[PDB]
Amino acid sequence: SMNPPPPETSNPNKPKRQTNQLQYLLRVVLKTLWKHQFAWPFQQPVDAVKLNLPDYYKIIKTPMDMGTIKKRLENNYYWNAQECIQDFNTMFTNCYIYNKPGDDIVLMAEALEKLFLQKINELPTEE
């Protein structure tokens, strides 16, 4: 079995910014979800070898996880908040696509997504 290369977290060709919204995405949004009891399956790319999921990357072609998001935020990979928000939504959508309704992992994603929505609802206006 083989995992794909992880999503990139560094690209010197890519223009970068540090905006107040991106600071909020790290200091509030990521930190809230990262410390949650249900964060652990989402803190790194899905390891299809260790978890014995040989079809995972046959099904999921745009992988995303909070370890990648954390690195992107800490290394100022993004230009805007919408890129980061899209990464979180990709992570949740992948989980709902691959897994079955009512699975433990889906209940975990739902709890994290609820908090995500609560925090993004108060995303600050851009400075």
Ligand SMILES: COC(=O)N1CCS[C@H](c2cccs2)CC1
């Ligand atoms: C976000 O992680 C995933 O979607 N995976 C696909 C199968 S569910 C599995 C897990 C189930 C219960 C704990 S961990 C994690 C890996």
